[PDB]
Structure formats: structure tokens, C-alpha cells
């Protein structure tokens, strides 16, 4: 996270970190959307151009953490995947369209004060909260700048940018299954996700029911916190109908 702050303990109960079993290595962020289902970005598992094609036997999950390094005994919960699901129409050889993947835990995790699911958006919520100007929250243990690994979970609130601006800022073909967020050149503030933040959640709090909803998944970005450049997020609500896999 670029221009972030250390999060308070228990800020993001749904935060999940995708790990490489051997050698231990942090690969991505992810979110706990149920006691047995973790949501992440497909590019965290499959992206041929970089030689990525992770199998269940290569991955591992660590939930309830705060420190990037320290193994927090009894707060933290390590688990292994059962099956990985990557969207059938995930376009990796073009614009990363449908950058979404579901990870099914082998054994149901035990919720606690540090482990709790996030809500998925519904029509009403998506309609009321998805508006340019409205700020959302991104969290992760990724680089603090273009590589800086944070010792503690970072957090940053970023505003939703209007589509015309998102499209104009890049050459990549933006689809409706993705949106961008970040401060504009004149907005006088900075911040953005970065390497290691991919897969992490972008959440918004609903004043209607006091509940946090995941509106997007940290997807691609051309650099970290670059002027005129915005970070892209997988549009969760538009892909909720696929999220079919769970049933």
C-alpha cells in the first residue's frame, strides 16, 4: 500500500494472505467471504506471461494476521486449499478481464474477533454506494512503493473515479467488470495498492445497516501511485452471479 497507515488490530477481519508453502513467500491478498471460501484475483494464481500457474499443492492460506512476518500464535489460522476456481472467461492475454478466483478451504475455519466474513454487494447497495467521489478502503501487506514490505497491515482510503477518467488514463481496454480508484493530479492526496496487494479487498461501509461490503478485488495497475495513473479493481457485484460456484 502506497501512502497508507498501519491498520488497527482487527480492522480487516476478512483479510487473508495467500502464501507459497515452500519456500515461504507472500504471494497475494485475498478475502474471507465465508468460513470456507476465500475470494482473490485470478492473476494471483494464473498468469502465463510471468510463468504463474499455482496449484492447490503449491498454495497455502493464513487468516487473522496483523504482522507480515511474525506467526501470531492463536489469533492466526493457517489452512490449505481444497480446490481452486478461476473464472472461465478470465482474459489474461489482453486486459485481465474477469480477474477473479475462488479458493475453497479444505476444512471450515473457526471465526473469531480477528476472523470474520465480509458482505458481498446486492443491487441496492451497489446502486447506492458505487458513485465517483465516494471513498473505499484497500488493505494489504504489499510494497510501500515500487520495488519496503510493511511489518504491519497497511490501510488506505481511495475515492472511486468516474469511468471516462479511468478509460482516458490508460491504453488497456477497460471493461464494465472493472473500475478504478485513486486521487487525481489536482486532488492533493496520494495512495494506491501495489505489489503484493493483488487479490486484496476494496470495501465500502453502508450507512444503511452499518455493514462492510466488498465492492472490488485489487486487480492490475500500471505502476504504484503514479500521477495520472489509477489502480484497477475487479467489479465484484457484476461477477457475483458467477460467485454459482459456491452452490
Amino acid at each position: 500500500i502506497v501512502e497508507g497507515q498501519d491498520a488497527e488490530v482487527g480492522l480487516s477481519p476478512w483479510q487473508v494472505m495467500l502464501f507459497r508453502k515452500s519456500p515461504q513467500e507472500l504471494l497475494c491478498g485475498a478475502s474471507l467471504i465465508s468460513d470456507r471460501w476465500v475470494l482473490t484475483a485470478a492473476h494471483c494464481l494464473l498468469y502465463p506471461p510471468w510463468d504463474k500457474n499455482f496449484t492447490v499443492d503449491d498454495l497455502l492460506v493464513r487468516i487473522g494476521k496483523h504482522s507480515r512476518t511474525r506467526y501470531e500464535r492463536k489469533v492466526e489460522k493457517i489452512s490449505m486449499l481444497d480446490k481452486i476456481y478461476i473464472h472461465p472467461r478470465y482474459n489474461w492475454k489482453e486486459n485481465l478481464d474477469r480477474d477473479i478466483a475462488l479458493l475453497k478451504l479444505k476444512r471450515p475455519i473457526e471465526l473469531s474477533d480477528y476472523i470474520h466474513p465480509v458482505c458481498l454487494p446486492d443491487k441496492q447497495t451497489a446502486a447506492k454506494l458505487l458513485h465517483a467521489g465516494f471513498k473505499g478502503r484497500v488493505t494489504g501487506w504489499g510494497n510501500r512503493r515500487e520495488t519496503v514490505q510493511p511489518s504491519v497491515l497497511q490501510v488506505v482510503n481511495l475515492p472511486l473515479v468516474e469511468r471516462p477518467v479511468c478509460k482516458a488514463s490508460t491504453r488497456i481496454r477497460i471493461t464494465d467488470n472493472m473500475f478504478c480508484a485513486g486521487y487525481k493530479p489536482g486532488e492533493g492526496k496520494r495512495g494506491d495498492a501495489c505489489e503484493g496487494d493483488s487479490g486484496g479487498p476494496f470495501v465500502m461501509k453502508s450507512p444503511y445497516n452499518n455493514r462492510w461490503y466488498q465492492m472490488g478485488i485489487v486487480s492490475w495497475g500500471e505502476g504504484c501511485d503514479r500521477d495520472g495513473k489509477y489502480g484497477f479493481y475487479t467489479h465484484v457485484f457484476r461477477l457475483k452471479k458467477w460467485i454459482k460456484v459456491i452452490d
Binding site: 497507515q5 465500502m204 462492510w212
Partner: peptide, 25 residues
């Protein structure tokens, strides 16, 4: 879901939560 045990359930607002609501206005 979305109700954090150490925050929403404790009726405690997190440090930056204010920014989000302000942006809605």
C-alpha cells in the same frame, strides 16, 4: 457479515472510518 467484532459490534468507529462517511456528503 461486515460487522467487525472489535469495531461495529463494540460500537467503536475506526480511526479512518470518518473519511468514508465524509466522502458520501
Amino acid at each position: 457479515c461486515g460487522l467487525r467484532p472489535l469495531f461495529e459490534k463494540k460500537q467503536v468507529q475506526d480511526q479512518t472510518e470518518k473519511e468514508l462517511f465524509e466522502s458520501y456528503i
